[PDB]
Design a binder for this molecule. Structure first.
Ligand SMILES: Nc1ncnc2c1ncn2[C@@H]1O[C@H](COP(=O)(O)O)[C@@H](O)[C@H]1O
Ligand SMILES: [Mg+2]
Ligand SMILES: [Mg+2]
Ligand SMILES: [Mg+2]
Ligand SMILES: [Mg+2]
Ligand SMILES: [Mg+2]
Ligand SMILES: [Mg+2]
Ligand SMILES: [Mg+2]
Ligand SMILES: [Mg+2]
Ligand SMILES: [Mg+2]
Ligand SMILES: [Mg+2]
Ligand SMILES: [Mg+2]
Ligand SMILES: [Mg+2]
Ligand SMILES: [Mg+2]
Ligand SMILES: [Mg+2]
Ligand SMILES: [Mg+2]
Ligand SMILES: [Mg+2]
Ligand SMILES: [Mg+2]
Ligand SMILES: [Mg+2]
Ligand SMILES: [Mg+2]
Ligand SMILES: [Mg+2]
Lengths: 205, 95, 64, 120, 107
RNA sequence: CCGAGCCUGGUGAUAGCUGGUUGUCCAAGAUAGAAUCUUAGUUCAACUUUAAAUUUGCCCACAGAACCAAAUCCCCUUGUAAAUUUAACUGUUAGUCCAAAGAGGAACAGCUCUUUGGACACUAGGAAAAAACCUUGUAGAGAGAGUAAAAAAUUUAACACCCAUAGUAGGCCUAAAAGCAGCCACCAAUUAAGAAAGCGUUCAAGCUCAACACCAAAAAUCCCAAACAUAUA
RNA sequence: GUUAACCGUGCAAAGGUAGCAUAAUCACUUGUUCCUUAAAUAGGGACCUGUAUGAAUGGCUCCACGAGGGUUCAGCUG
RNA sequence: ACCUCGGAGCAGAACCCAACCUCCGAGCAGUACAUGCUAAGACUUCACCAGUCAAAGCGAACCUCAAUUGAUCCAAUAACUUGACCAACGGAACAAGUUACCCUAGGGAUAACAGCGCAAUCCUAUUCUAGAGUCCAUAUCAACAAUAGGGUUUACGACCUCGAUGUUGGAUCAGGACAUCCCGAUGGUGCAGCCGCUAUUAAAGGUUCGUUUGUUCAACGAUUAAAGUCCUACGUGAUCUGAGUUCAGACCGGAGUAAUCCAGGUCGGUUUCUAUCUACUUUAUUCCUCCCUGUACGAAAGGACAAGAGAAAUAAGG
RNA sequence: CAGAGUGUAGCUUAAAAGCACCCAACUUACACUUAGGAGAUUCAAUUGACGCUCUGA
């Protein structure tokens, strides 16, 4: 059964507990689903964001429509929408408790592989629809092969090594020079430069 | 303290006729204990008749075979179904 | 800040992959003995002690 | 939350390249520091304000002489971004009781005793 | 709705190396974040206090529960055959000696 | 000037409310929390002032501060000079933005609510004008001097040319479904051309392709310094 | 239950009777239709889920009267 | 809705820390009856009051539980002792409505109008190619989504004004934007022609009169070339109206024991200013008729543009 | 029947030990506990000769 399965809105056994919006689950690099697990191609999330059910549905549909069925398969590597979003009744004033759970969403960070594809491949064929899917998604995304990813990583490494600018960000941060840690976050030692919010800056290093 | 090298020293959670039949059951249990197998449970099931059980889980074929042989070497047995003879006994497995 | 332990931590070797295979001290006495042994041993983390603290003959005997 | 920042100790270790770049030697390290306040305490945390005052670095561009030792260096590290530090290097011998009056810090941090305003 | 309870102000009142007189409370807690060690008592709150003049010290000592206290015993039994629990203990290390013989008179 | 007249007296009624509080000069001087018919106030605390007595005060370094990140506490040396107590008090106890960690709200607000740190309510220079961003604090005169912060950068979508015969209107399936309605197989003739990758055919046909040969913007009075690519950091 | 005479059943003290009714009568509400206008969220006449009508809190007719409030034929007039 | 007390998260590592933030609970039980006396030394819910722990000693043996509670004066008691859902829980010994008949002190520290921020909602444009369009994603529609922009809406916020700034409509006069309703100039067409649909450019000029209606709106009647969308304190009350509507009188329905109320209905209901200062106070469009012509175009039905001539209309100036 | 590793009772950086093990009682049974039980340097002066494991024939 090679095709994207149904990712249904909400969990069946729902959660009555209203989760307080920890936006940290968007921010930063993805701890979890970074490296390939038996798909050869993927959709790499370059920026963080909350994936809605609609988005998921779209991704399911499009891929299915353009899926070489006997040749190819497609995996889900983001879990199902599990983070509840609460919204107050329309136009009410501030206060009077928290809003009611309206829907559910999936947190995704930069580095997360949203979808995987594998099978007998045509690079062009995969890229076409995967790129479309990426574009459709609510963050900056990239249709990415294994080899391509590796190349990118290598390039990044080279950049890190190369730069003739004597001052890196990391050095400035950890060594505290200027009173600059007063401006910076405590997460700008872990992420260094690169990550500003949900966003990510591949070029700078 | 967290930041001290003696961090999780206290950590513990991660570490954590009838008469004859009965006798036979006991013996079986003892044997199981000796040979390092999980004895889950034992029952007291209802002329007269009397049944006893020794629930067992997890044992490799060769070892299992050996165990069976030892059991064989009175009353009766019932677990492939492996019955034998010399009230009642029934050592149900779960290999 | 997470510092690594200076020497080897206690309870490292015995946790293993599986818990259900081991013997466990079903008694208290054994546990007590183990504790005593541990106490007797030195450790790196200060700790209590830092702050406060023929054959023929045999044969004959056997015969007797 | 903004906090009192603790610096990793690898930051304060001179490489051979570093040595080459600057003047100092790893053996026979300089005894004293000329510490000058080059940047205002205003707009910095109160602990940094305190540190400057403890070092006596109240007038900017007016320099103080501090022992080079772990204790003094810890304070100096706290306000390193407010101060310029340079080794007190005495080309002639350090001031005796006869030469206490005639001295001159100069630029290039050197103390001098033979201070005559006439040229060579 | 619900409750808004005040902060409980519990925790350590005296740290390692502090000079602590007999009676001084050392650390207050709910449950045992620290346990009583040498010359240190326990009040009904589980609060730890000094039983003698001296210096506070903290140590990680092997923990054996009382046989009569059941739950601890059970836990111990559960552990694997080379495991030892360990727990933190607070001691007072006494300074001034209890006694000095003085000369009353020559009789 | 009747929701209860007018005058005199009690009556200088009472106001946690508003307004106002008059010579000079200097100095120290800012909003942790409590309760409270209480949040327009108050009284304790906290901070603040003075006069005393005093010995330590801040910076802090190894050790140390459960289990179920940033940091902090404790803290000897050390750099410094003050902090604790006693004696008298008043006044603040309706705060703002910026950075950071969070919470509510729209991952809205010059929005609301905590915490850590700045700044402002106190001069100056800058950021056009500017409270809160940055540089900078202890004072006065000079028709002296060195500096700090401090002046935004860009400009972007061409692309191939030629040549295309056959077993073959593969079969199975289809009324018919011929490289291309959907499956199975995807074999092969000459140099070389997929049992066919887009169109297109009612089905055929014709077009190609693969293969040989050739080599970023759009608002409501009227744009908004003037301008300038080139003599040496 | 059978728009329902009628049936079954409950509660009540009595269970809104005559009349009148989109009204000076919570809303729905430009209710629906006939008349009036070239054209009518106006006016008149009918109908009735008025779920919020109604009997000296007076209900319903109707003669005269009214600087009361609505609609209008004709004429007339900056 | 809540108002006292406790536990968990926010508040991840000494305490402390809010919200009409998120979640659990309590206002008791059970065992004793040395839950006897006293007492060094501490902690403390950021004050005080209340709470907590407690060595030794003297008397005796050989407490559990998280929260499980409440001051003073007064009562009741021979005395020991015991008295509140004083639950608004630091408690006034005992207290309700209503006020468009209202008054006073204040407040932009707190709303309605207006502005301002934001932009949820709303409006627009791209991207994307799902799907409609006998076939054919892009003549024309357009799903899921993505990226921008606007500030018409209803909100939200409470930053200026409560020693007032006059609030819906309408008249008068209009300045502006264009995101073009009309009149030009083009590109596509599922454009033969006539009529269309869509796209670029264009803001000179223009953008009807009535019935109803408080009204914007809306419907209908007649027109038209068109009968634009908006902004300007919902443009404009020291230029006007006051029909609504922000008061005093009154009814009908309802709510209320009643005074009296209703984001219910209906009749009535005073709109003041002599201008100090700024500002300012003489610089062509379009429709239709005729001809072309009943020609082009089309199989027929119908049916054109351009060039030309004539009449009108409005606007400006005499 | 020729070589190599050796050779404390099940097992040990034990030196006659401690762990293991057995019986009875309590235990449905297991487990715990309480009573009891049994066991060893293969043998002659660091050397030799009996016992295994292993590899050859
Ligand atoms: N249960 C009670 N406990 C204590 N004092 C009370 C109690 N009930 C009434 N009072 C006192 O009795 C006084 C008179 O009130 P009564 O209701 O007549 C009050 O001022 C109270 O202090
Ligand atoms: Mg007065
Ligand atoms: Mg001063
Ligand atoms: Mg604010
Ligand atoms: Mg505010
Ligand atoms: Mg009505
Ligand atoms: Mg009329
Ligand atoms: Mg009657
Ligand atoms: Mg009359
Ligand atoms: Mg206190
Ligand atoms: Mg005692
Ligand atoms: Mg009235
Ligand atoms: Mg009245
Ligand atoms: Mg007034
Ligand atoms: Mg205000
Ligand atoms: Mg104000
Ligand atoms: Mg289609
Ligand atoms: Mg335009
Ligand atoms: Mg007027
Ligand atoms: Mg006006
Ligand atoms: Mg009148």
């Amino acid at each position: 059964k090679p095709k994207l399965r149904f990712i249904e809105r909400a969990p069946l056994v729902p959660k009555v507990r209203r989760e307080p919006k920890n936006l940290s689950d968007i921010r930063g690099p993805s701890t979890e689903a970074t490296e390939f697990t038996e798909g050869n191609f993927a959709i790499l999330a370059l920026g963080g964001g909350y994936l809605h059910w609609g988005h998921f549905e779209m991704m399911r549909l499009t891929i299915n429509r353009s899926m070489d069925p006997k040749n190819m398969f497609a995996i889900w590597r983001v879990p199902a929408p599990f983070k509840p979003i609460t919204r107050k009744s329309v136009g009410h004033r501030m206060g009077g408790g928290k809003g009611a759970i309206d829907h559910y969403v999936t947190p995704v960070k930069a580095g997360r592989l949203v979808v995987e594809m594998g099978g007998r491949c045509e690079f062009e064929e995969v890229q076409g629809f995967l790129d479309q899917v990426a574009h459709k998604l609510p963050f900056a995304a990239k249709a990415v092969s294994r080899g391509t990813l590796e190349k990118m990583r290598k390039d990044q490494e080279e950049r890190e090594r190369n730069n003739q600018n004597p001052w890196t960000f990391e050095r400035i941060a950890t060594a505290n020079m200027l009173g600059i840690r007063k401006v910076l976050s405590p997460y700008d030692l872990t992420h260094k430069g690169k990550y500003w919010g949900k966003f990510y800056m591949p070029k700078r290093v | 303290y967290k930041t001290k090298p003696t961090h999780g020293i206290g950590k513990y959670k991660h570490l954590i006729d009838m008469t004859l039949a009965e006798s036979y059951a006991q013996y079986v249990h003892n044997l199981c204990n000796s040979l390092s197998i999980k004895v889950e449970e034992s029952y007291a099931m209802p002329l007269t008749t009397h049944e006893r059980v020794v629930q067992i889980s997890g044992l490799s074929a060769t070892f299992a075979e050996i165990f069976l042989e030892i059991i064989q070497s009175g009353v009766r047995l019932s677990v492939x179904x492996x019955x034998x003879x010399x009230x009642x006994x029934x050592x149900x497995x779960x290999x | 800040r997470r510092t690594p332990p200076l020497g080897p931590m206690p309870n490292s070797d015995i946790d293993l992959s599986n818990l259900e295979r081991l013997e466990k001290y079903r008694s208290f006495d054994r546990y007590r003995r183990r504790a005593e042994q541990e106490a007797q041993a030195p450790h790196w983390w200060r700790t209590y002690r830092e702050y406060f603290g023929r054959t023929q003959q045999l044969l004959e005997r056997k015969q007797a | 939350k903004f906090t009192r920042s603790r610096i990793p100790e690898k930051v304060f270790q001179a490489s051979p390249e570093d040595h080459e770049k600057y003047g100092g030697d790893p053996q026979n390290p300089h005894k004293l520091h000329i510490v000058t306040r080059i940047k205002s305490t205003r707009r910095r945390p109160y602990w940094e304000k305190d540190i400057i005052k403890m070092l006596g670095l109240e007038k900017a561009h007016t320099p103080q002489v501090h022992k080079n030792i772990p204790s003094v260096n810890a304070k100096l590290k706290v306000v390193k971004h407010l101060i310029r530090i340079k080794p007190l290097k005495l080309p002639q011998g350090l001031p005796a009781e006869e030469n206490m009056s005639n001295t001159c810090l100069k630029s290039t941090g050197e103390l001098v005793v033979q201070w005559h305003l006439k040229p060579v | 709705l619900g409750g808004k309870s005040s902060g409980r102000r519990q925790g350590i009142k005296k740290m390692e190396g502090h000079y602590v007189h007999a009676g001084n409370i050392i650390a207050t807690q709910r449950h045992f974040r620290w346990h009583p060690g040498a010359h240190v008592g326990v009040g009904k709150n589980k609060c730890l206090y000094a039983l003698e003049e001296g210096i506070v010290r903290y140590t990680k000592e092997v923990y054996v529960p009382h046989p009569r206290n059941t739950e601890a015993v059970d836990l111990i039994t559960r552990l694997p055959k080379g495991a030892v629990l360990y727990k933190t203990f607070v001691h007072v290390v006494p300074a001034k000696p209890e006694g000095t013989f003085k000369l009353v008179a020559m009789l």
